[PDB]
């Protein structure tokens, strides 16, 4: 009733913009938009651009992803 996975990749936050979102650059040289999830939010974190993070891309559009896990 709901089969669907995602592409977990690593990316470095290149910039941080309002709306609880930020820009991330992949080692491939490309860049993608990412949004924060409610999980890492519960952990209560405050990451700042320039930090590496894991980017989760959605099969709905490899143009946007989301950060749900940043290095310790």
Swiss-Prot record:
It comes from the Bacteria. One of its GO terms (cellular component) is cytosol. InterPro entries: NA-bd_OB-fold (IPR012340), RNA-binding_domain_S1_IF1 (IPR006196), S1_domain (IPR003029), TIF_IF1 (IPR004368). GO terms for molecular function: ribosome binding; rRNA binding; translation initiation factor activity. Residues 1-72 form the S1-like domain. Keywords: Cytoplasm, Initiation factor, Protein biosynthesis, RNA-binding, rRNA-binding. Pfam families: eIF-1a (PF01176). It is found in: Cytoplasm. Its main location: cytoplasm. Component of the 30S ribosomal translation pre-initiation complex which assembles on the 30S ribosome in the order IF-2 and IF-3, IF-1 and N-formylmethionyl-tRNA(fMet); mRNA recruitment can occur at any time during PIC assembly. Belongs to the IF-1 family. PANTHER family: TRANSLATION INITIATION FACTOR IF-1, CHLOROPLASTIC. One of the essential components for the initiation of protein synthesis. Stabilizes the binding of IF-2 and IF-3 on the 30S subunit to which N-formylmethionyl-tRNA(fMet) subsequently binds. Helps modulate mRNA selection, yielding the 30S pre-initiation complex (PIC). Upon addition of the 50S ribosomal subunit IF-1, IF-2 and IF-3 are released leaving the mature 70S translation initiation complex. This is Translation initiation factor IF-1. The gene is infA.
